[PDB]
Write a protein that binds this DNA or RNA. Structure first.
Ligand SMILES: [Cl-]
Ligand SMILES: [Cl-]
Ligand SMILES: [Cl-]
Ligand SMILES: [Mn+2]
Ligand SMILES: [Mn+2]
Ligand SMILES: [Mn+2]
Ligand code: NA
Ligand code: NA
Length: 326
DNA sequence: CCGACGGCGCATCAGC
DNA sequence: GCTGATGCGCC
DNA sequence: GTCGG
């Protein structure tokens, strides 16, 4: 981690702008620079050297020089010492509490974990569960556990209907040795871009995972996207495994490639890639890649039979999932 | 100097 | 009930 | 906050 000190600083600045400033573009700018710097293969000696990188500008170069000189940034030193900012940043670590709700809670005098615990009745469902598992959700998932979880989901899904295909994406598919959570893309030939011949396709699967006590809680759910909690089973006399986040996204089967591109990420890889498509006259979503017409509007879906096809359209050499960890 | 910055699912709420 | 705005979430 | 035009 050649420039861990700098990228940590930028990440902290990004979080501040998002959770406290509510300046979402500053948030995206900081994350973009942190990312471009993380992959830069030299130990950075000056801001001017970082500025040569796209995404790193004058302001970030200045902060980089301060950080290399002193080992800190005064701006962040002060943000840390600010009670309202610290509280707001903390509350936003609970799933379901964002910048708006965090500020509101701080206003009402709710600003710690203990305050939250005694004011459970002030939380919506999602927040209640986010709080319930606050500690567990901060732990990472070793790839070995991800492999155990994969086997359970794929095997249980098989038991509902052999025609389902479940694919674990997210950092797992990019080959990470540890994951923040588990993301599962689901397809079934009853659900395509042209028709929904079978209702309840996602629910059925959620039910089955709930039946075997894998899924333990639900944050939100609809016809195509489930967001909840899950837990691996423990052996006799062994400590319980931590509760984990799970996301399941049902995608039309004929649009699997755009879907697996989306759900593989990273999030920054996706932003970068979709921005580039626009520059080249295309717009990409989890469903389709389409042409931009002369006016502002998108054309019919272009044919796609591979992830690589999407890269071709926008004139990018193909990138393996393992190299999409931006 | 400026305008754009990726795209979209689910929960909640205000107005009708 | 509907619809659109907003929040929070996903990668 | 950074970028292209
Ligand atoms: Cl902003
Ligand atoms: Cl610092
Ligand atoms: Cl589409
Ligand atoms: Mn994930
Ligand atoms: Mn996830
Ligand atoms: Mn994520
Ligand atoms: Na630059
Ligand atoms: Na949160």
């Amino acid at each position: 981690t050649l420039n861990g000190g700098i990228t940590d600083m930028l990440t902290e600045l990004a979080n501040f702008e998002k959770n406290v400033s509510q300046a979402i573009h500053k948030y995206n700018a900081y994350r973009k620079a942190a990312s471009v710097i993380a992959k830069y293969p030299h130990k950075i000696k000056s801001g001017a050297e970082a500025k040569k990188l796209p995404g790193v500008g004058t302001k970030i170069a200045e902060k980089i020089d301060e950080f290399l000189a002193t080992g800190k940034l005064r701006k962040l030193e002060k943000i840390r010492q600010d009670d309202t900012s610290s509280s707001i940043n903390f509350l936003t670590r609970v799933s379901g509490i964002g910048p708006s709700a965090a500020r509101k809670f701080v206003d009402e005098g709710i600003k710690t974990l203990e305050d939250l615990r005694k004011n459970e009745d002030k939380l919506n469902h999602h927040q209640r569960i986010g709080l319930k598992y606050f500690g567990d959700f901060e732990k990472r998932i070793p790839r070995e556990e991800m492999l155990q979880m994969q086997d359970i989901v794929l095997n249980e899904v098989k038991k509902v209907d052999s025609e389902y295909i479940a694919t674990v994406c997210g950092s797992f598919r990019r080959g990470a040795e540890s994951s923040g959570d588990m993301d599962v893309l689901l397809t079934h030939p009853s659900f395509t871009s042209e028709s929904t011949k079978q209702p309840k396709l996602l629910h059925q699967v959620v039910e089955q995972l709930q039946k075997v006590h894998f899924i333990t809680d639900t944050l939100s759910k609809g016809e195509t996207k489930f967001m909840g909690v899950c837990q691996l089973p423990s052996k006799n006399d062994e400590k319980e495994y931590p509760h984990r986040r799970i996301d399941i996204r049902l995608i039309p089967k004929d649009q699997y490639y755009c879907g697996v591109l989306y759900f593989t990420g990273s999030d920054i890889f996706n932003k970068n890639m979709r921005a580039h498509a626009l520059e080249k006259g295309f717009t990409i979503n989890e469903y389709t890649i389409r042409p931009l017409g002369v006016t502002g509007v998108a054309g019919e879906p272009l044919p796609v039979d591979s992830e690589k096809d999407i890269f071709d359209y926008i004139q990018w050499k193909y990138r393996e999932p393992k190299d999409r960890s931006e």
